[PDB]
RNA sequence: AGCUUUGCGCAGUGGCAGUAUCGUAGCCAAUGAGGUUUAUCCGAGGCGCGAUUUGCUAAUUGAAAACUUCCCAAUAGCCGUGACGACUAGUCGGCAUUGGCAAUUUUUGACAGUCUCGAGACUGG
């Protein structure tokens, strides 16, 4: 309001205002579509791979389940490849679980090691939901408590 | 029967030893430590804290450097002299101590160097 009192800006057209209006309307369409996709992918990924979704987050769980080629290919991958799963001058030897929110929830030098912590345990989680045990996700909850317990252990 | 591999133990030669060798009871660690190289790859301990027995010998200071001393008194050659003694003023033997013992015959150095085949020669300017 303070800088709308002094804008130094000229008015738009009617075509310019309606062009910006439909641009903002399709932008809200893209935002609501993104959140609809997010809700569906978290629901169906908590059904398909509950423990991996609990550890990493179900969108990144779906990304590393897809680029590996499903759960039954994600299990028989080691922990040192699921770290680099989704890789490609921005950061090297990084996968989809380096740019996760739970691996960016810490200082920038605390990052790489944390990737190896989230890659290993979720690999266990991936193996745990390659067979259909722990459908409620208790292995994911226990391992995720272990993850952020180690994160709080490293932090001050 | 011989050869031989791997791990461990013992001893020995040699090498290394504070960017070395360990402890860790605190935490983490193959359910993955730690990764800038080659990363759909590698794979072992890591971070902190804390350390780096025993016998022998030398040397120094110190009065004393840790295994059951100093001090006084006396005892442990010959020419003269004094007595005692012996033998005829003289001689001899032993004992004793109240002066002396580097000037040719002795005990305060004619010795030292050299040369020749047990024996001699040369020099000491």
UniProtKB/Swiss-Prot annotation:
Keyword Coiled coil applies: yes
GO CC term (a single one): spliceosomal tri-snRNP complex
GN (gene name): PRPF31
Function as written in the Swiss-Prot or TrEMBL entry: Involved in pre-mRNA splicing as component of the spliceosome. Required for the assembly of the U4/U5/U6 tri-snRNP complex, one of the building blocks of the spliceosome.
Site residues, Interaction with U4 snRNA: 80
Site residues, Interaction with U4atac snRNA: 112
Predominant cellular place of this UniProt entry's protein: nucleus
Protein name in the entry: U4/U6 small nuclear ribonucleoprotein Prp31
Domain notes: Interacts with the snRNP via the Nop domain.
Disease tied to this entry: Retinitis pigmentosa 11: A retinal dystrophy belonging to the group of pigmentary retinopathies. Retinitis pigmentosa is characterized by retinal pigment deposits visible on fundus examination and primary loss of rod photoreceptor cells followed by secondary loss of cone photoreceptors. Patients typically have night vision blindness and loss of midperipheral visual field. As their condition progresses, they lose their far peripheral visual field and eventually central vision as well.
Marked site: Interaction with U4 snRNA and U4atac snRNA: 93, 116, 121
Keyword check for Signal: no
Outcome after substituting residue 93 to A/K: Reduces binding to the complex formed by U4 snRNA and SNU13
Organism for this UniProt entry: Homo sapiens
Cellular location(s): Nucleus; Nucleus speckle; Nucleus, Cajal body
